Design a protein around this ligand. Structure first.
Ligand SMILES: *[C@@H](O)c1csc(N(C)c2ccccc2)n1
Ligand SMILES: *[C@@H](O)c1csc(N(C)c2ccccc2)n1
Lengths: 302, 302
């Protein structure tokens, strides 16, 4: 029992992290087979950011402009190319610690672990979610560019996020590993800001199911509701619509607790209308939406 | 910017985890140099737990009673001994992945990362604190016995916790790596229960400082207070006393934000008297006490 913001073990990823320097810019890269992947921002200066032409900035560079450091060992760059917002630096050595891996793109509402890194050295590991507005609420300082997000299934690392920047509200934006931003954000200097955000309803439901599995039940009730009447109330509280698919995905949790999905919705509605009246759920005084149904099963079941 | 429950990267620890079987009991062990460390509970059955004599149970065992599995490779046990509540199984092979390490014992109020493990395979990594009542609020299922807690400084793993069991309230109890329980808990079947718990005041203060560093400031006020008048109120709210030492340890955070420690106490007092009035601090509606002053500096400063 117990319910924590639990990341994947980070080892397979730590063995791929490297330091990439170009000019006076240092940041992190990801070293898989004989390629290192990193934000293209590495070829810019401060004054370049106001409107860079990256195709331009790159053609004026050479392999020798890029220093790659893996631990101590210098890696020799033998090729460079841009892929959307990432660079790919071909190097003369394949990473011996390359795991089985895939580059996936996730959806808003899905979670992943982040290995924050500085100068090629991993500093910490946490879990977060892609928000509906394609930001994440990360924890990142200067130098963290190129830190990666991931999920692990069996021995296979699904890399899903590369870190690029912090927006004015203090939230974070980045790309998939093919260099395509999550959300309408650009790697240039702009008044760009996170769009309006919502609560991930299906996740809140999944977390209510975690809480019941962990013996908190005070918020349960004998009421039920229609999907439609539920969504009427969720809309009112800036919660995302719940769909039949989400109802179906909650099925195993509903069967394991014998609470019907729509009964759990009835509970949520009342929590939205009445608040908590000073109690908590899994150590929280707020409704938590950063755990997927998969997260709950994996942690409350194995 | 951003503020997360951030664990240490778990890699150095994942390379030490192994599976230990004796009889029909399987659990985890920690493989450092040519020793594997594991809970002594591994030599018991269900019916042994009612009052085991472990000195007895152990003398009736042999090296061949203990199967150690590291990944695939079988490890050969060439020696066994008990040390308080842990066993030490000498094996014929030193772990090539042994990091620099130390066995430390922590205090109530200090944090550490946990690598939950099942059958020798790491499943996830999270951060928690030793509570004032020497429990932790972990997230552990059947099979998790022997999972370890740790802190990492430079390349040196300070192992501080080995997991042994879950108490009736759903919280967790275990030992240091020399086999000495944290708190008044025993590895036998007893009506044993967590004692009364308190809030770690110094940590709450440290987290208020994190929040200011991250631009939440609504809870600040122009008041101050005495240490004595503060502790009068903290006592009333089941918060631990704050000491001069804690005031001194908060000094760098106070200097970095220019809020005096005692001014921050004045803020906390008002939050304890008035509640939050529906706002939040670093995404929380509660006062959070699982980050030390060290945690905040390391994460808001590097
Ligand atoms: C590190 O990968 C990276 C890419 S974009 C960026 N910064 C600091 C930036 C500069 C100016 C405007 C937006 C973003 N960091
Ligand atoms: C796994 O290390 C371990 C040691 S104590 C324990 N259990 C399940 C237990 C059984 C009976 C009374 C208290 C604790 N697990």
């Amino acid at each position: 029992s117990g319910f924590r913001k639990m990341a994947f073990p980070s080892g397979k990823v730590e063995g791929c992290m490297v330091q990439v320097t170009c000019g006076t810019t240092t940041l992190n890269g990801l070293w898989l087979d004989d390629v290192v992947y990193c934000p293209r921002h590495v070829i810019c200066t401060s004054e370049d950011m106001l409107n860079p032409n990256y195709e331009d900035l790159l053609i004026r560079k050479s392999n020798h402009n890029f220093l790659v450091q893996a631990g101590n060992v210098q890696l020799r760059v033998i090729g460079h190319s841009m892929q959307n917002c990432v660079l790919k630096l071909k190097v003369d050595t394949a990473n011996p610690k390359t795991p089985k891996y895939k580059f996936v793109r996730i959806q808003p509402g899905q979670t992943f672990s982040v290995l924050a890194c500085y100068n090629g050295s991993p500093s910490g590991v946490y879990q977060c979610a892609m928000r509906p507005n394609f930001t994440i609420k990360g924890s990142f300082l200067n130098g963290s560019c190129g830190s990666v997000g991931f999920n692990i299934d069996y021995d296979c690392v699904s890399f899903c996020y590369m870190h690029h920047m912090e927006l004015p509200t203090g939230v974070h934006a980045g790309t998939d590993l093919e260099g395509n931003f999550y959300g309408p954000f650009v790697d240039r200097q702009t008044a760009q800001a996170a769009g309006t955000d919502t609560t991930i309803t299906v996740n809140v439901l999944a977390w209510l199911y975690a809480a019941v599995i962990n013996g908190d039940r005070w918020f349960l009730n004998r009421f039920t509701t229609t999907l439609n009447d539920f969504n009427l109330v969720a809309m009112k509280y800036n919660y995302e619509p719940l769909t039949q698919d989400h109802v179906d995905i909650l099925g195993p949790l509903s069967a394991q607790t014998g609470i019907a999905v729509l009964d759990m919705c009835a509970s949520l509605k009342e929590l939205l209308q009445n608040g908590m009246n000073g109690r908590t759920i899994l150590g929280s005084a707020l409704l938590e939406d950063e755990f997927t149904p998969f997260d709950v099963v994996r942690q409350c079941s194995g």
